[PDB]
Amino acid sequence: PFLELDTNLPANRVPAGLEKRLCAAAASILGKPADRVNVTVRPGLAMALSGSTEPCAQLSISSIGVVGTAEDNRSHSAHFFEFLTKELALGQDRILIRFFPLESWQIGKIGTVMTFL
Amino acid sequence: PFLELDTNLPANRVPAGLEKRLCAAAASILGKPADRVNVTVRPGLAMALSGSTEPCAQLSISSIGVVGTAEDNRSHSAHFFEFLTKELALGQDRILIRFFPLESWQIGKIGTVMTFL
Amino acid sequence: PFLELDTNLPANRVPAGLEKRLCAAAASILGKPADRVNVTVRPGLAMALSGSTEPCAQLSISSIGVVGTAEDNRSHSAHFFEFLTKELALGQDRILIRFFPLESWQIGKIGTVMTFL
Numbered sequence: 001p002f003l004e005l006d007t008n009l010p011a012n013r014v015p016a017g018l019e020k021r022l023c024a025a026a027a028s029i030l031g032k033p034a035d036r037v038n039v040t041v042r043p044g045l046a047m048a049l050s051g052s053t054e055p056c057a058q059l060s061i062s063s064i065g066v067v068g069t070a071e072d073n074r075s076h077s078a079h080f081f082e083f084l085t086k087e088l089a090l091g092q093d094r095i096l097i098r099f100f101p102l103e104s105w106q107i108g109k110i111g112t113v114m115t116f117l
Numbered sequence: 118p119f120l121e122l123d124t125n126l127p128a129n130r131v132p133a134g135l136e137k138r139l140c141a142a143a144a145s146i147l148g149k150p151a152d153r154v155n156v157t158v159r160p161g162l163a164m165a166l167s168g169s170t171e172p173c174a175q176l177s178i179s180s181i182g183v184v185g186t187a188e189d190n191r192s193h194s195a196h197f198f199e200f201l202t203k204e205l206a207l208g209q210d211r212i213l214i215r216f217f218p219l220e221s222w223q224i225g226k227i228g229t230v231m232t233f234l
Numbered sequence: 235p236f237l238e239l240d241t242n243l244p245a246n247r248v249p250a251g252l253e254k255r256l257c258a259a260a261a262s263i264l265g266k267p268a269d270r271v272n273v274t275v276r277p278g279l280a281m282a283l284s285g286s287t288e289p290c291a292q293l294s295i296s297s298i299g300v301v302g303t304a305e306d307n308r309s310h311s312a313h314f315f316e317f318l319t320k321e322l323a324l325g326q327d328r329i330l331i332r333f334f335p336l337e338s339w340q341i342g343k344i345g346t347v348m349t350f351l
């Protein structure tokens with residue numbers, strides 16, 4: 001899975017090791033191995049969420065097969081909100097998630113695409 | 118109900134009173150009175166969870182009738198996770214639960230088995 | 235949470251399963267488990283809302299901890315209006331909400347009160 005987390009929390013208000021703990025969390029939530037989880041955290045940004053500049057965070061989640069239905073994404077959302085509200089000390093009104101299905105021909109790995117691996 | 122909690126948190130990082138609070142919580146969650154709840158806490162163990170020796174806990178829950186279905190246990194799990202995350206200051210990736218149905222002929226109580234009470 | 239919805243819509247103009255979908259929405263909005271959400275719908279009543287007998291609904295919401303501030307209730311209101319206007323086919327002017335904090339000693343469950351659970 002590919003996870004990108006944008007936040008207006010400064011780096012020194014994002015707990016040490018979050019990018020590693022999000023690999024374990026995404027592995028369990030999405031049912032793919034932790035060694036196939038990719039996380040990017042971009043702290044210190046200027047953000048408004050629901051019109052408000054109080055501390056907040058945005059997560060994008062991309063994967064083949066498992067983020068393409070409302071019913072699957074409902075379950076995924078519940079678990080990611082539980083994890084991130086606690087880690088970032090944010091209320092559930094201060095986080096939003098977007099889910100993006102991917103296909104194998106879009107993923108460039110070791111100089112080819114996943115279609116040929 | 119019968120609850121057994123193993124943790125690699127030392128005893129002095131397990132909050133005082135956890136046993137009676139877990140009796141009350143198990144009454145709320147499983148529906149059987151607090152005075153029928155049995156709790157065993159084993160702290161200071163050497164543990165790995167998901168391959169990692171960071172602080173963690175395992176809970177076993179055994180009961181007649183109420184821990185035997187996926188839909189029952191999904192609900193029970195959500196509540197026991199919320200209870201333990203708060204009490205032990207652990208993330209939900211650092212807790213696992215196992216559920217075990219029991220029958221009356223397996224429970225020895227006051228020198229007989231529950232079949233005869 | 236405890237939700238009570240009065241409406242002058244006849245029962246056959248309240249969509250089938252509304253009490254179930256409002257349960258799930260209220261769990262999300264209030265940040266409480268769905269197996270702790272209670273919904274009561276009372277249709278076919280004689281009602282005036284804002285002085286008018288046109289189709290309308292009144293919602294009451296009661297919960298520990300999460301319905302006691304203006305800022306929290308503004309957030310909750312926005313989501314409940316978005317849900318109910320669509321489900322009941324009512325304009326924003328035809329719904330009102332009241333929020334009521336509860337305490338643990340007020341809630342009777344399994345023959346005791348939540349103070350002891």
Ligand SMILES: O=C(O)c1ccc(C(=O)O)nc1
Pocket residue numbers: 001002032036037038062063064065102107109114
């Ligand atoms: O090879 C990549 O790391 C990779 C490729 C695919 C997926 C995925 O579908 O989630 N995740 C990671």
Ligand SMILES: O=C(O)c1ccc(C(=O)O)nc1
Pocket residue numbers: 118119149153154155179180181182219224226231
């Ligand atoms: O008498 C015991 O304490 C007892 C016996 C049975 C059960 C139970 O099925 O949950 N719990 C407790």
Ligand SMILES: O=C(O)c1ccc(C(=O)O)nc1
Pocket residue numbers: 145235236266269270271296297298299336341343348
């Ligand atoms: O455990 C009960 O069912 C319960 C307890 C509390 C609340 C509540 O605060 O809204 N709702 C339900």
